[PDB]
Symmetry: C2
Subunit: 607 residues, 2 copies
């Protein structure tokens, strides 16, 4: 039972902070009320803590085994039993479109439900993303393809996203897998893809939809020349869904990884074994990179939310350990060798550690749920008063924060969780070292942190003309401008907001200097990740302070018992974060204001 959930904080964000319940029972969510949403969260949290978390250790210690002659993978039995628990509850259809068998709901509620699976056994959610992919295929498909997507969703087929090649990882546009058009309008896909998650999955599903980027013969170069293809593991009857002949797409290797071991990560060979890999052009148009980014956006949201879910259960494990571990005397009695021994939560450095973990875990939860409130036009209208166009641009702005800042932060603060256990934290008997291993990948797949920071600056700020950024900054400034019990926190936030504004101005400055001296663009690259992390810190501190303001109101109204303790912890967290994390942004702004190209001019031989 490694997984420790936090429904209370989820509901606090969804209802008391963001007001997502304002849309429940109205319009698209007419048949889902606030009580039902709360019961779903409790239900999936309990299932996550039980049957899903049950095989978390098994999947790591008894990982999938590859048979290279059948080109298939065997998963451990306990993990497949967790997968069936997921399917039997319908949790592979959270927020799926109603016409595909789904229950309509705000994306903020959907991601909070998913948080529990990602905290308990994140590879289980990844294997279960087939219906979500069926829905993207549906939205992008022809009328006839929409009929296959409906079948795939109803039969619960698995799915993969197939981009990476050995020479084309960050540079997707360099891929050489090719597509050869047939007279009847299908295509034959030829190439080897690498690092494909779930490319085989034992007997979990009756079929797998591979969504494959490939370059049609004679198409131009880069990502703009790529097309997206529906390549099923098995041919099937397009009218009934009955499974047919094996299609020419075969796993030829399974990687040995640091963590996330139960997710089979596969070399995938298309058309290499003398059987054609038939693919159907998605939507029967050539628009591959744009179509595939519908998938990439969801994957990046998932990876950020995965890292955040894992830091949260890492923190709650550390806290429960610390509450019970007796070691040493209180610091006020450190010289008295007969003083009473105390539990380690009495020690300042452990409280520092735990509050650092708490504030980042909770601030990150607020960030991904805040981000999700812009993913439905109706939620964004009802809770923020912003129209659909700006909501989409704000969601797109925040996705690289959820992914890049979420993955980096969670991994770094799990170091504090492990440390809280002392030497025991190094044992596989406790789950934190596996949290660390399982979460290292989140800075890498779905685009590395450097790729997230480059997306954030060039596409989500500059190409956006700063409109989404200016929107969020205006909300932060409005909080600062508005009791004086948060006076010191608002002053710290004001300094941090000006620090980030100063970073944006410097980086924009280097970009405009590149009109005259091309090399000046390198300074944007030097400072981009630090800027992305600074915006994440500023958002964490703002959202914690918002949570603190709500908590003050609820305490003033007369909260008691466990509610009172919860609200007290929000005040302490927002105050701790403002005073210990935000001021570092000032030094980071001055560092960014002084970047230079010395490190770019250095001979490679001098490293």
């Amino acid at each position: 039972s490694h997984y420790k959930s936090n429904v209370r904080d989820q509901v606090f964000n969804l209802f008391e902070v963001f007001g997502v319940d304002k849309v429940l029972g109205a319009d698209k969510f007419s048949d889902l009320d606030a009580d039902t949403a709360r019961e779903m969260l409790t239900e999936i949290a309990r299932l996550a803590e039980g049957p899903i978390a049950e095989s978390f250790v098994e999947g790591d210690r008894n990982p999938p085994v590859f048979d290279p002659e059948t080109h298939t993978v065997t998963l451990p039995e306990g993990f497949k039993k967790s997968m069936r628990a997921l399917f039997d509850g319908g949790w592979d259809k959270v927020g799926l479109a109603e016409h595909l068998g789904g229950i309509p709901m705000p994306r903020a509620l959907q991601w909070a439900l998913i948080e529990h699976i990602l905290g308990a056994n994140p590879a289980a959610y990844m294997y279960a993303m087939g219906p979500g992919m069926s829905e993207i295929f549906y939205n992008n498909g022809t009328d006839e393809q929409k009929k296959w997507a409906t079948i795939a969703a109803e039969r619960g087929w698995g799915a993969t996203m197939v981009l990476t090649e050995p020479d084309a990882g960050s540079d997707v546009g360099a891929g050489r897998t090719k597509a050869v058009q047939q007279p009847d309008g299908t295509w034959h896909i030829e190439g080897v893809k690498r690092f494909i998650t779930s490319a085989d999955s034992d007997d979990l599903f009756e079929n797998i939809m591979h969504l494959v980027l490939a370059r049609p013969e004679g198409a131009g170069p880069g990502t703009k020349g790529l097309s997206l293809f529906f390549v099923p593991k098995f041919h099937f009857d397009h009218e009934t869904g009955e499974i047919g002949e094996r299609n020419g797409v075969f796993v030829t290797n399974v990687e040995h990884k640091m963590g996330l071991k139960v997710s089979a990560t596969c070399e995938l060979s298309l058309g290499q074994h003398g059987i054609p890999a038939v693919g159907w052009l998605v939507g029967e148009v050539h628009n591959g990179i744009a179509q595939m980014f519908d998938v990439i956006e969801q994957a990046r949201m998932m990876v950020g939310t995965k890292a955040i879910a894992t830091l949260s259960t890492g923190y709650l494990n550390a806290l429960e350990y610390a509450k019970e571990r007796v070691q040493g005397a209180d610091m006020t009695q450190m010289t008295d060798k007969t003083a009473p021994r105390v539990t380690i939560t009495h020690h300042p450095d452990v409280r520092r550690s735990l509050m650092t973990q708490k504030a980042y875990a909770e601030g990150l939860r607020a960030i991904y749920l805040y981000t999700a409130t812009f993913q439905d036009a109706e939620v964004a209208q009802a809770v923020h008063g912003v129209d659909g166009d700006l909501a989409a641009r704000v969601n797109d702005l925040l996705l690289p924060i959820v992914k890049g800042f979420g993955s980096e932060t969670a991994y770094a603060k799990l170091t504090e969780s492990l440390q809280t256990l002392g030497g025991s934290g190094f044992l596989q008997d406790y789950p934190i070292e596996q949290y660390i291993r399982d979460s290292k990948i989140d800075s890498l797949y779905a685009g590395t942190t450097a790729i997230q920071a480059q997306d954030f600056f060039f596409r989500k700020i500059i190409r956006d003309k700063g409109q989404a950024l200016a929107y969020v900054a205006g909300e932060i400034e409005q909080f600062i401008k508005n009791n004086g019990r948060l006076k010191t926190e608002r002053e710290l936030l004001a300094t941090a907001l000006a620090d980030v504004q100063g970073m944006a101005a410097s980086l924009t400055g280097y970009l405009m200097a590149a009109q005259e001296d091309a090399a000046s663009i390198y300074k944007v690259g030097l400072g981009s990740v630090r800027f992305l992390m600074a915006v994440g810190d500023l958002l964490s501190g703002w959202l914690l302070a918002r949570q603190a303001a709500v908590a003050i109101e609820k305490l003033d109204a007369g909260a008691t018992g466990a509610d009172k303790s919860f609200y007290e912890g929000k005040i302490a967290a927002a105050s701790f974060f403002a005073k210990n994390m935000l001021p570092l942004l000032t030094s980071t702004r001055q560092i960014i204001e002084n970047l230079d190209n010395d490190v770019m001019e250095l001979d490679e031989a001098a490293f």
Copy 2:
């Protein structure tokens, strides 16, 4: 070649061109070891480390030790035992051993540079080889009779352990309850269970193991002052001839399953619980256990810090070699051109940022442990610093928790950049970086957690010392700042020195004000680790800048070729470190000056 990439060039640069250790080679204690021989020794052990020692790095992780409950022994993988035999056959387990025990006299600074290579290539191999060094400590603390046993133990190459920790006594060594009962013949029977004992069994590597066990004589007082230290051998032996006799009652009962460092058997150790007494001999025949054991702990803390630093160094050189060859993307100056030539990733600004961060910290940390070691011999300290024996010992004691605490935390943090440089391939066991990360996570925990390092540094190495060692080091930094091409670095170092000075003053004020307000002491606890880390960053910046001043002198004298590249890299690293790492200490000073007890007052239930 192997996973292990060594850096003898940087070691020799530090030892000779920066600290002038070659000035003592050939004279007095080191009469028979000249500079040429020292360099050939470093080259020889580097090749041993890259060859047979590194050969079983992966194997000890993938095929880890197995506990046998039928015999209460541990079995080690055959390839790792072959590596151990290569270490012994070359005499490398007698590096810096006293001449009368069979060693080769050498400066401690040379000794630790030699040991760095084993710690980089397979650090558990050095840990299993620490027997002869423990015999020397037993010799130094022993009676005349006991010195004869310690001589035999060195000559026969017996293994050794340091046996302190119990389930309820880890950081708080003084809570130990293992008991010592004196026998009529003047031996003792030791009774208790110890936990997490490194090398507590080692298969058939040795013919005997010396366990150095802390235990509380019946009737003694509480805390660490009531502990005594006992020589408890695995087998009884003839005190004159060394011939091995009957088994003594000290048995391993389990082996821990760990995140990393798997080939180091970490064992529960039972004394007197299996039907025969564990006979022990009181060391020095005096009751002075925690003082005696700290002779061992001091060495273990130097070892752990040097291990973490060795591991970052080979992590960096692996990532750098990968980056030079990995082609991905276009030059940022050609971002918008999708037919622009592809480049190797060292052309990308974020990768150069990541590599220079790894390089500056790895080399700064190497400078710190070598500098620390130049204070471990009175003669070296006199010859290269002009300091007498008493001040030397105090400065070495000041620097040890920096080597250990700042070393372990920094190495694990910056290996994250090493892994990131490989992209998705960094997450594969095919490359050594993910094992580096798992193997080095323990360095912040054993030999005293980081918080214990930070408390030792401030309470014992500064306050109890009345700032003598600290003022000495600060005066050497100020002298460098005092002194054109290094004007900016010296200005940034002056800011960092004043920041650390401000931190020390604030924390000393919180401590002294505890006399009138007891809870004031908690702010010392809240800030101690950040203070320790700030001193390590300041030392790193200063030593790198000193290196850059030597590099400038050598370039002015006409260095060419590979020498010139090396020197250019030192100037670049010192400058990058001063401009990108040092300024953050200003925000950390201001954070420390505003610490408060809110987080101490918060109800535990609010977390």
